[PDB]
Amino acid sequence: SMELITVHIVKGPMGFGFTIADSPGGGGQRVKQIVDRSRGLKEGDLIVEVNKKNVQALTHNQVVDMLVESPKGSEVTLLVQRQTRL
Ligand SMILES: [Zn+2]
Numbered sequence: 001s002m003e004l005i006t007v008h009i010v011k012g013p014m015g016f017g018f019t020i021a022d023s024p025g026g027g028g029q030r031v032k033q034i035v036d037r038s039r040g041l042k043e044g045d046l047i048v049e050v051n052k053k054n055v056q057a058l059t060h061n062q063v064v065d066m067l068v069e070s071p072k073g074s075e076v077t078l079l080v081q082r083q084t085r086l
């Protein structure tokens with residue numbers, strides 16, 4: 001089933017440890033790859049919010065720049081939609 005999950009990720013010296021790309025259904029960005037830190041995130045997670053604010057209407061470049069600009073050593077929260085069917 002589709003669940004909403006809050007995940008906390010501390011930005012490390014090498015970044016947050018994941019990559020994103022556009023959702024085929026147009027509801028935002030999905031987690032493309034977990035390059036790592038991002039322990040509660042999963043590939044395919046739809047990013048619905050960053051720091052409790054909705055980001056579904058933002059483009060790929062906008063979400064990326066939001067993460068890039070987030071300060072060194074600070075945490076970001078993400079609300080994600082995840083298919084939890086095993
Ligand atoms: Zn936290």
Ligand SMILES: [Zn+2]
Pocket residue numbers: 060064
């Ligand atoms: Zn990109």
